[PDB]
Amino acid sequence: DYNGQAKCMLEKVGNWNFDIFLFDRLTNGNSLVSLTFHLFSLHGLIEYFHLDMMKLRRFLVMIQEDYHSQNPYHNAVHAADVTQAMHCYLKEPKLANSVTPWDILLSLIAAATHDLDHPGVNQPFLIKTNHYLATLYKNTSVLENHHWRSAVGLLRESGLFSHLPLESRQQMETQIGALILATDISRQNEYLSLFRSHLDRGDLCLEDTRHRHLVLQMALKCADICNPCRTWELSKQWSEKVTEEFFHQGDIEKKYHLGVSPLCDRHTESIANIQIGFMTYLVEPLFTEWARFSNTRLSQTMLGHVGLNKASWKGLQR
């Protein structure tokens, strides 16, 4: 019964108002696997790369279960959402008309795994608590590097692409890594500035692999923080979950005298002030530039929701 209603939702998987929460409820927490598997079929990746469907399900399942379902925000549901948003961007004219099956393949996988095995606390927390991951990656894109090497781990263990040449598997790993590392919010000014320069010069050539992947990296960055770009009802749920996770890190910091990180203090920081600032300083600048690149209706819609949703947070004050 429930698994019959899920199929129908996937018919509108390219819709910006797709309800990922419902989809995950109907599938019993199998949204990432169910949605990503469908996208592989939909983009014809199974045939294109002679994929063993048994190996594909195993791989997708290893990914989904490697997410901590206990994190209120960084879990497989969040991954599924980013993956779904990525799919809508790939449908945009300028990308649809230049990406190769291979690009779509790396895009979807990178989206599905960009927060793999996320611990639920940020980088500065891992650094000041001397977490081995911070040591391993020399306090640089600690989380993103961890998500990527984990992805490379599941890629190898699944043997999904064992029939492809080594060189190809290695490139797949390198390009997925470049896509995942671009999601390190900490380095957005560098990524946004570069993108902006190119949009000003108007020199981007989409038939060039490098330029095309810079764009794909910006699309992944968008997908990762497009929560405020969704309809209020969806955006509201994400705002509460990300804030809940932030506050939990804060409670731990307070309890163990580690110093309460910014945005993580439930006593001195409002969920509204957090969302407003986030939308004003990180979401809006990014999507404006993206709108300069992909000047379509989806871009207007997305910036539109950010406008409405933000006012609603201000409204929810005084």
Ligand SMILES: CSc1nc2ccccc2c(=O)n1-c1c(F)cccc1F
């Ligand atoms: C809602 S996610 C988020 N909110 C912020 C609010 C103020 C300052 C910084 C952030 C921020 O870095 N994030 C964020 C992100 F944009 C991407 C990944 C994780 C995050 F915590």
Ligand SMILES: [Mg+2]
């Ligand atoms: Mg991340």
Ligand SMILES: [Zn+2]
């Ligand atoms: Zn993310």
